[PDB]
Amino acid sequence: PQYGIAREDVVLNRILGEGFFGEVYEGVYTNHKGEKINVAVKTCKKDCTLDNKEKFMSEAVIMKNLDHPHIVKLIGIIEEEPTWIIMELYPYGELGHYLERNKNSLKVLTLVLYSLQICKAMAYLESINCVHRDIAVRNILVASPECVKLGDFGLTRLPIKWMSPESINFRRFTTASDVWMFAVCMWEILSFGKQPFFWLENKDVIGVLEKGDRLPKPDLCPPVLYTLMTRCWDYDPSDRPRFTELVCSLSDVYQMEKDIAME
Numbered sequence: 001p002q003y004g005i006a007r008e009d010v011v012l013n014r015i016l017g018e019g020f021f022g023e024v025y026e027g028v029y030t031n032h033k034g035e036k037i038n039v040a041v042k043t044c045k046k047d048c049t050l051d052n053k054e055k056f057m058s059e060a061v062i063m064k065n066l067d068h069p070h071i072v073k074l075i076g077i078i079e080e081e082p083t084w085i086i087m088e089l090y091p092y093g094e095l096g097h098y099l100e101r102n103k104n105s106l107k108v109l110t111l112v113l114y115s116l117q118i119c120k121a122m123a124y125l126e127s128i129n130c131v132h133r134d135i136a137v138r139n140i141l142v143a144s145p146e147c148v149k150l151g152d153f154g155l156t157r158l159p160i161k162w163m164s165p166e167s168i169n170f171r172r173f174t175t176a177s178d179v180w181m182f183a184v185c186m187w188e189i190l191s192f193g194k195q196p197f198f199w200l201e202n203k204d205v206i207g208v209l210e211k212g213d214r215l216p217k218p219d220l221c222p223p224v225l226y227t228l229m230t231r232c233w234d235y236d237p238s239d240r241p242r243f244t245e246l247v248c249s250l251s252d253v254y255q256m257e258k259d260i261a262m263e
C-alpha cells in the first residue's frame with residue numbers, strides 16, 4: 001500500500017486567501033484510487049518564527065486526529081520542504097458571506113440546522129475538554145446548502161464581541177466560555193451574518209455585559225431559541241447549559257421548525 005500523500009499527488013491552481021500562518025491555495029489532490037479531490041492547501045510563511053512553525057504543525061496534528069461530520073476535514077500532511085496541510089475544499093466558502101448572499105432565500109429551518117450542526121461539533125470537542133476559541137460565522141465553512149463545518153483556527157487581537165465576561169476580564173477560556181461564544185455564533189447565523197454589537201466599540205462591550213445587557217433577538221429567531229441563547233449568556237458560567245443539553249434543545253427546535261415548514 002502507499003499510505004499518506006506525496007507532493008506529486010497535489011497540484012496548486014489558485015490563491016484561496018491568507019490563513020493565520022500563511023497563504024492557502026486551491027488545488028486538486030489525486031487519490032490512492034485515482035480520484036481527483038478538490039483541496040485547500042495551507043502553508044506556513046517561510047520567514048515565521050520556530051514557535052510559529054511549531055504551532056502550525058501542532059494545530060495540523062490535532063485536526064488530523066479530529067473526525068466529525070461538522071468539523072473541517074484534514075486529508076493529509078506533507079511535512080517536508082514547504083510544509084503543506086491538505087484540507088478538504090468547501091466550495092461555498094465562509095458562512096457569514098454565504099448568509100449575507102442568500103439572506104432572501106434561507107428559511108429559519110436551515111439556520112437552526114446550521115446551529116445544531118455546529119453545536120454537535122462542539123459537544124464532540126467538549127467530550128475531550130478541547131476548547132475552541134473561534135466559534136464564529138467567519139470561521140465556519142459551507143460544505144453544501146445543508147451542511148456546515150466548523151473551522152480549524154482557534155482550535156493578541158481577540159474576538160472581544162464574541163467572548164464571555166470571564167474571557168474578557170481574565171483571559172479564562174473553558175467549555176462554558178465556548179457555550180457563551182457558541183450562542184453569539186447562533187445570533188450571527190440568525191441575523192444573517194451581522195457582527196455582534198456592531199453598534200459598539202470593543203472597549204464598550206464588557207461594561208454593557210456587566211450591566212446585564214445582551215444581544216437582542218434577531219427578527220427571524222424563534223422566541224424559544226432566543227431563550228436558549230439567553231441561558232448561554234448567563235453571567236455565571238456554572239449556570240450555562242452544557243453542549244450535550246444544547247444538542248437536545250436544538251434538536252427539538254429543529255424538529256419543530258421542520259414540521260412547521262412541511263405543513
Ligand SMILES: CNS(=O)(=O)c1ccc(Nc2ncc(C(F)(F)F)c(N[C@@H]3CCC[C@H]3N(C)C)n2)cc1
Binds near residue numbers: 016072087089140
Ligand atoms: C468566503 N470566501 S471565498 O474566498 O469565497 C472562499 C473561502 C474559503 C473556501 N474554502 C475553504 N475550504 C476549506 C478551508 C479549510 F482550510 F478547510 F478550513 C478553508 N479555509 C479558509 C481559507 C483560508 C482561511 C479559511 N477561512 C475559513 C477562515 N476554505 C472557498 C471560498
